[PDB]
Design a protein around this motif. Structure first.
Motif, PDB file in Angstrom:
ATOM      1  N   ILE A 193      39.860  69.822   8.860  1.00 64.64           N
ATOM      2  CA  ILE A 193      40.459  70.566   7.756  1.00 64.64           C
ATOM      3  C   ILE A 193      41.572  71.460   8.280  1.00 64.64           C
ATOM      4  O   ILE A 193      41.359  72.267   9.191  1.00 64.64           O
ATOM      5  N   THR A 194      42.770  71.328   7.707  1.00 66.97           N
ATOM      6  CA  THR A 194      43.800  72.308   8.007  1.00 66.97           C
ATOM      7  C   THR A 194      44.106  73.250   6.858  1.00 66.97           C
ATOM      8  O   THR A 194      44.608  74.345   7.118  1.00 66.97           O
ATOM      9  N   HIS A 195      43.810  72.889   5.608  1.00 63.58           N
ATOM     10  CA  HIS A 195      43.848  73.897   4.550  1.00 63.58           C
ATOM     11  C   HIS A 195      42.742  73.655   3.541  1.00 63.58           C
ATOM     12  O   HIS A 195      42.373  72.512   3.256  1.00 63.58           O
ATOM     13  N   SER A 196      42.270  74.757   2.958  1.00 59.99           N
ATOM     14  CA  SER A 196      41.124  74.770   2.055  1.00 59.99           C
ATOM     15  C   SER A 196      41.537  74.659   0.593  1.00 59.99           C
ATOM     16  O   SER A 196      41.128  73.720  -0.092  1.00 59.99           O
ATOM     17  N   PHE A 197      42.323  75.632   0.112  1.00 55.33           N
ATOM     18  CA  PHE A 197      42.858  75.702  -1.253  1.00 55.33           C
ATOM     19  C   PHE A 197      41.741  75.651  -2.299  1.00 55.33           C
ATOM     20  O   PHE A 197      41.540  74.643  -2.984  1.00 55.33           O
ATOM     21  N   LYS A 198      40.967  76.737  -2.340  1.00 53.85           N
ATOM     22  CA  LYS A 198      39.970  76.899  -3.390  1.00 53.85           C
ATOM     23  C   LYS A 198      40.669  76.955  -4.742  1.00 53.85           C
ATOM     24  O   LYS A 198      40.600  76.000  -5.521  1.00 53.85           O
ATOM     25  N   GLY A 199      41.366  78.053  -5.017  1.00 52.85           N
ATOM     26  CA  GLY A 199      42.526  78.047  -5.885  1.00 52.85           C
ATOM     27  C   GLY A 199      42.360  77.755  -7.362  1.00 52.85           C
ATOM     28  O   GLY A 199      42.715  78.572  -8.217  1.00 52.85           O
ATOM     29  N   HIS A 200      41.820  76.583  -7.666  1.00 45.85           N
ATOM     30  CA  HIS A 200      42.090  75.896  -8.913  1.00 45.85           C
ATOM     31  C   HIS A 200      40.926  76.039  -9.888  1.00 45.85           C
ATOM     32  O   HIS A 200      39.975  76.789  -9.665  1.00 45.85           O
ATOM     33  N   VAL A 237      43.121  65.697  -0.213  1.00 45.39           N
ATOM     34  CA  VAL A 237      42.031  65.183  -1.029  1.00 45.39           C
ATOM     35  C   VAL A 237      41.395  66.349  -1.775  1.00 45.39           C
ATOM     36  O   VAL A 237      41.101  67.395  -1.184  1.00 45.39           O
ATOM     37  N   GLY A 238      41.243  66.194  -3.076  1.00 47.72           N
ATOM     38  CA  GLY A 238      40.643  67.227  -3.902  1.00 47.72           C
ATOM     39  C   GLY A 238      39.462  66.687  -4.672  1.00 47.72           C
ATOM     40  O   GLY A 238      39.521  65.597  -5.238  1.00 47.72           O
ATOM     41  N   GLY A 239      38.393  67.469  -4.703  1.00 40.48           N
ATOM     42  CA  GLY A 239      37.147  67.034  -5.294  1.00 40.48           C
ATOM     43  C   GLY A 239      37.149  67.087  -6.808  1.00 40.48           C
ATOM     44  O   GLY A 239      38.190  67.036  -7.466  1.00 40.48           O
ATOM     45  N   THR A 240      35.946  67.179  -7.364  1.00 41.57           N
ATOM     46  CA  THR A 240      35.771  67.316  -8.798  1.00 41.57           C
ATOM     47  C   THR A 240      35.375  68.722  -9.210  1.00 41.57           C
ATOM     48  O   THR A 240      35.079  68.948 -10.385  1.00 41.57           O
ATOM     49  N   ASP A 241      35.339  69.663  -8.282  1.00 38.39           N
ATOM     50  CA  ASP A 241      35.496  71.067  -8.611  1.00 38.39           C
ATOM     51  C   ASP A 241      36.854  71.506  -8.089  1.00 38.39           C
ATOM     52  O   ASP A 241      37.633  70.695  -7.587  1.00 38.39           O
ATOM     53  N   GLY A 242      37.131  72.797  -8.169  1.00 41.53           N
ATOM     54  CA  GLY A 242      38.429  73.227  -7.701  1.00 41.53           C
ATOM     55  C   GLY A 242      38.443  73.475  -6.210  1.00 41.53           C
ATOM     56  O   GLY A 242      38.100  74.570  -5.753  1.00 41.53           O
TER      57      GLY A 242
END
Lengths: 242, 55, 162, 247, 116, 232, 35
Positions: free
Chosen positions: F54-61, F37-42
RNA sequence: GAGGUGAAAUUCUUGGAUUUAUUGAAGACUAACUACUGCGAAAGCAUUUGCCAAGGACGUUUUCAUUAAUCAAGAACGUAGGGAUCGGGUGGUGUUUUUUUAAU
């Protein structure tokens, strides 16, 4: 409103349920002219880039009222918002030009008080290009140092002299300049100090501002000149692969 | 050129100021008269060439 | 400047944000600190706090706007109704203030709100329907009524309050 | 039409599923050098890329291919006048400037970008009588330098463009021309002192002038910018033309 | 990296409007009023009505993608009150709380120069 | 506020997390126990659904995050994530090393509808968009390249690629079947008399039946496994 | 009007005290003085 | 949904009312500055600039030499003192000012 109010003979016309337009809308970003710094000012929805009232001509008329602190990054002028007319759409970046300028009203409503008189002037002046500006100017009486009287009023025959010299010198400052030069000399607020230096002889004159530039006629497009105000660009290939 | 502008400004402001006060207090004429100078005018040469130009 | 010692601790240690008194443009700017300041509406509440104080209410009244966040601040003018030429304007503000502030303090203690009034523009802070009650009493008095009649009307409105 | 005379792509008809008659016309007319590309906005158009050049206009290569595809495959196109004094302009030693066109002004625009950097630096410092208006007057700023200004080109006599600056209209300027020009040298010494103080990546050196005669003391400064260009600063005052009229 | 809308919060009489637009002014996003949340017709200028109206606008604008809002408060103007009522501050407090970054609070109420 | 309901007789809220941004795209794996699931920020969080956290964060984008997809075969060691975008890009993450595999900036609008498969690690992927470009890539594990673009004229939402190698597209209430390695629309449904378009395709019985949920509140069935061996 | 006369007395007092305090009280900058 | 009120209601609105933005036209008015300040015989008179005349005070070692006042009929228009301020003049001598362009 609710269920108990009324039907009112206007809700019988049926509703044409959903169109979901934000899946169809498209994001562009705006590039300000290079007289300023930080030319990226934000983004704009338009429409889907189709034919039959296309995007690139449903565009190119609008204005954006950005703040000068948002353009310059310096909070010394949080007021004095400007209006940029989006003019030439070129590859996802709305290239814009200058269109106007105005004070946010709180600044002048906190500048004006009683026990002083304020002076207004405004001229219609053509630049060295074919733009014509109703450029304005506001001025205020300084309470002189070592004064005693509460008044500090102008004699209203000094007012004609101050308004004559202020219209003359800002008519000179417009007519010896182009519009890009007018913006680059209006941003670091220098015709104000020029008015105060050339007008402190007659009266002490607390803070001077210009507060309004209204464009009334534009010459032509001149796509090359508008691209020269930012930087060049040549839209070229992307791979076919079909 | 820094010592040049220092020395040139140092002698120039001195001779300008002494000419200014000399025209600001030049009251005596040899026959009774008092020269009208005008406010903040800097030189007897300046008012002389001005009154020659206004002919 | 005389109330700055009581303004900033409810802007720093009670409420979490930080202040600067700018002498550049003679204003007050408020930042919120990302490291430890909670309450994501506290910036707006503290801004409205100093806004009420610089607008003219006293500092305890502005603290009463800061705590108990549902008190808003309405403002209107004398010039909108009956156009009030200057002699009648003096009659108007003298009639609203009464004598030694007594009619204004009557409206204050009656409608559970607090007003202040400049030379042509008045401001009422409180809860919303109390703002409306005080505003209709003030606009009746500025239309020009016997103060005994507006006292009786405020007795009825205080009976609505109880 | 000199506006889009050297536009390096020629946008033909748009792309759809039903191939229209003008799309078929364009396909059969160009053929081996036609393509369909997406542009940056997102639309898809049949077009033809053209490798532009400095010693030619692209209309030469276009009329070459569009005659050797249609009228005859041996009809030789001969022109040499354009190729002879189209490169009598000096070829500026830039990235890919032989491949770029001649209506490109990107050397001038890069020079003006360095000038805007110097413009911001010379404004947001502090003077005893601050700058009213700094404005360029130079040949690269009017796009009529002979060679296109490449960075670090010392030996071109059109290298040092002149920018002028006018200060505020202050009454405390001195009277005669040697002292006001010496005060202009004083102001220039101040701005180069603070420039070497705060922005070490630029550099400055003074220069006597001699074109305005009978005052040997007119001094300009010259800024050598880290982008690679140089500028010659001249101070103008309100007292100058009335001093000359006094003389 | 943030992008900016423009609030155009209208603190009218007997009603309150909030509709964020992209900062040209053409493409409006999620016009709400004070009427289309409450069901009484008496307090369609309620501070609570403007509060949940601004909450719904904040949700829809975060759904579209705008994160900051240049906010511009307009009263009804004209020869009338010329000054924001309570609904303007109510909507301002609501969409300043509701996770949306706020920029450049102003006042764009029209001033008459002595009209009728 | 993320919640999960175990669909079995314990219909209670099993796990409930506080996610950062209000999100508008979710995808679980082709297997179970992975929910992205990904929000409306990165920020693209992924969650093991059994012991839910949570198993992964992935700020990333960058920007708000469009549709995305898993790469899941049971008992593998690959486990990639697709990660579309609004400003047109596809930034593929794995899940076994938490690294950005390949950054790809090539599109012009919201990258809706991307899909990952392998054909003999080959792992070809395909990313549509609100622009009309489906733009499949080879996508090796170490360093990747590009192949054909094959350009459907739609506004493709959930381009479920790689049917039986044949792609799908929807977005004008038009379910276009397109061949791969060359371009030809070969099956395409009847354009309706509304303006409302495809919100979502849904695969049933291992990519053989297709549910079609519209912009209108209707939901249709297609039977691709019959109407591909069938025209229209 | 009493407040007006009181404010004028305050301003005259301030000006007399300011006048009382007034009565009781490198190369390139030397060249760049007087501006 | 808009309006409107103490509540309502009438009205307007999917042929898109309210709101938003870009304009264009029309007439009227001159927000703040605005005061125990200015003018006019009085009613009244507030945007800028120019023209047309007029008027008041001051200044005056200029002229005329009682030409003055008061009003029916008629006519045009509709007790002494002190502080502060506005307009003019004189003198002083500090800062604002500045200097061979004029002005004051």
């Amino acid at each position: 409103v609710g269920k108990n109010k009324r039907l009112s003979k206007g809700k019988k016309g049926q509703k044409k349920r959903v169109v979901d337009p934000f899946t169809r809308k498209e994001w562009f970003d705006i590039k300000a002219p290079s007289t300023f710094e930080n030319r990226n000012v934000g983004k704009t929805l338009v429409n889907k880039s189709t034919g039959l009232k296309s995007a690139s001509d449903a565009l190119k008329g609008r204005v954006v009222e950005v703040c000068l602190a948002d353009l310059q990054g310096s909070e010394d002028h949080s007021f004095r918002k400007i209006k940029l007319r989006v003019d030439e759409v070129q590859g996802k970046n709305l290239l814009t030009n200058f269109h106007g300028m105005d004070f946010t009203t709180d600044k002048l409503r906190s500048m004006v008080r009683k026990w002083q008189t304020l002076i207004e002037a405004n001229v219609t002046v053509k630049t060295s290009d074919d733009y014509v500006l109703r450029i304005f100017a506001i001025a205020f009486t300084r309470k002189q140092a070592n004064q005693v009287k509460r008044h500090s009023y102008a004699q209203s025959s000094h007012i004609r002299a101050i308004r004559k010299v202020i219209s003359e010198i800002l008519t000179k400052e417009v007519q010896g300049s182009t519009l890009a030069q007018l913006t680059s000399k209006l941003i670091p607020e220098v015709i104000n100090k020029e008015i105060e230096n050339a007008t402190k002889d007659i009266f002490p004159l607390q803070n001077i501002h210009v507060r309004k530039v209204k464009l009334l006629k534009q010459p032509k497009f001149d796509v090359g000149a508008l691209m020269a105000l930012h930087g060049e660009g040549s839209g070229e290939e992307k791979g076919k692969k079909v | 050129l820094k010592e040049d502008i220092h020395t040139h400004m140092a002698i120039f402001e001195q001779r300008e100021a002494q000419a200014q006060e000399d025209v600001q207090s030049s009251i005596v004429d040899e026959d009774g008269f008092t020269l009208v100078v005008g406010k903040n005018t800097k030189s007897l040469n300046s008012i002389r060439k001005k009154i020659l130009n206004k002919n | 400047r005389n109330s700055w010692t009581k303004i900033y601790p409810p802007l720093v240690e009670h409420l979490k944000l930080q202040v600067r008194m700018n002498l550049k443009t003679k204003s007050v700017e408020l930042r919120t600190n990302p490291k430890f300041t909670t309450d994501p509406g506290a910036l707006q509440k503290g801004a409205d706090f100093i806004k009420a104080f610089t607008l003219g209410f006293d500092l305890d009244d502005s603290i009463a706007l800061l705590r108990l966040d549902d008190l808003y601040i309405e403002t209107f003018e004398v010039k909108d109704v009956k156009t009030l030429t200057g002699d009648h304007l003096s009659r108007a503000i003298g009639r609203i203030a009464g004598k030694d502030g007594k009619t204004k303090f009557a409206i204050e203690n009656a409608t559970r709100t607090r007003i202040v009034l400049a030379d042509s523009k008045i401001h009422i802070l409180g809860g919303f329907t109390h703002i409306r009650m005080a505003r209709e009493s003030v606009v009746s008095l500025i239309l020009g009524s016997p103060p005994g009649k507006v006292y009786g009307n405020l007795r009825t409105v205080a009976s609505r309050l109880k | 039409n000199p506006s889009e005379c050297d536009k390096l792509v020629t946008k033909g008809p748009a792309h759809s599923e039903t191939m229209s008659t003008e799309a078929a016309v364009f396909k059969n007319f160009w053929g081996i050098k036609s393509s369909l590309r997406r542009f940056k906005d997102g639309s898809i158009t049949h077009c033809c890329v053209w490798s532009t050049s400095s010693s030619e206009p692209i209309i030469s290569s276009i009329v070459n291919f569009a005659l050797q595809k249609h009228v005859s495959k041996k009809a030789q196109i001969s022109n040499e006048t354009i190729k002879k004094f189209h490169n009598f302009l000096p070829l500026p030693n830039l990235p890919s400037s032989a491949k770029t066109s001649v209506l490109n002004l990107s050397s001038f625009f890069n020079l003006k970008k360095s000038f805007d950097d110097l413009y911001k630096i010379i404004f947001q410092m502090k003077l005893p009588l601050s700058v009213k208006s700094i404005l360029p007057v130079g040949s690269a700023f009017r796009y009529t330098s002979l060679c296109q200004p490449v960075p670090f080109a010392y030996s071109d006599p059109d290298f040092f463009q002149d920018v002028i600056l006018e200060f505020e209209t202050s009454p405390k300027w001195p009277d005669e021309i040697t002292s006001l020009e010496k005060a202009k040298t004083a102001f220039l010494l101040k701005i180069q002192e603070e420039l070497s103080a705060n922005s070490s990546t630029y550099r400055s050196f003074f220069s006597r002038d001699e074109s305005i005669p009978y005052n040997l003391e007119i001094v300009t400064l010259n800024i050598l910018t880290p982008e690679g260009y140089g500028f010659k600063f001249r101070v103008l005052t309100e007292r100058d033309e009335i001093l000359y009229l006094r003389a | 990296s943030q992008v900016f809308g423009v609030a155009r919060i209208y603190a009218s009489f007997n009603d309150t409007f909030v509709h964020v637009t992209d900062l040209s002014g053409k493409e409006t996003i999620a016009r709400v009023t004070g009427g289309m949340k409450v069901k009484a017709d008496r307090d369609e200028s309620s501070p609570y009505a403007a509060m949940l109206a601004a909450q719904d606008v904040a949700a829809k604008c975060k759904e579209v993608g705008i994160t900051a809002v240049h906010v511009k408060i307009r009263a009804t103007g004209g020869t009338r009150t010329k000054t924001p009522g309570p609904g303007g501050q109510a909507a301002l407090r609501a969409l300043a709380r509701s996770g949306l970054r706020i920029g450049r609070i102003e006042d764009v109420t029209p001033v008459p120069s002595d009209s009728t | 506020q993320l919640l999960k309901i175990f669909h079995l007789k314990t219909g209670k809220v099993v796990r409930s997390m506080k996610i950062s941004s209000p999100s508008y795209i979710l995808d679980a794996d082709s297997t179970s126990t992975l929910l992205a699931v990904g929000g409306t920020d990165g920020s693209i969080i992924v969650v093991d659904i059994e012991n839910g956290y949570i198993t992964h964060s992935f700020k990333g984008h960058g920007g708000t995050i469009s549709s995305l997809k898993f790469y899941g075969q049971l008992n593998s060691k690959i486990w990639l994530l697709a990660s579309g975008d609004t400003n047109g890009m596809v930034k593929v993450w794995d899940l076994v090393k938490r690294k950005c595999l390949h950054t790809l900036q090539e599109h012009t609008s919201a990258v809706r509808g991307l899909d990952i498969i392998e054909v003999p690690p080959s792992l070809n992927l395909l990313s549509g968009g609100r622009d009309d470009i489906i733009n499949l890539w080879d996508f090796n594990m170490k360093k990747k390249c590009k192949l054909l673009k094959t350009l459907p004229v739609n506004q493709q939402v959930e381009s479920c690629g790689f049917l039986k190698i044949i792609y799908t597209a929807g977005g004008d209430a038009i379910f276009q079947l397109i061949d791969s390695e060359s371009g030809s629309v070969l099956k395409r449904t009847n354009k309706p008399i509304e303006e409302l378009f495809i919100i979502g395709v849904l695969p049933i019985l291992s990519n053989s039946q297709m549910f079609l949920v519209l912009s209108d509140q209707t939901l249709q069935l297609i039977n691709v496994e019959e109407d591909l061996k069938n025209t229209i | 009007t009493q407040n007006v006369i009181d404010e004028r007395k305050l301003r005259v007092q301030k000006q007399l005290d300011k006048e009382k305090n007034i009565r009781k009280r490198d190369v390139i900058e030397e060249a760049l003085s007087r501006f």
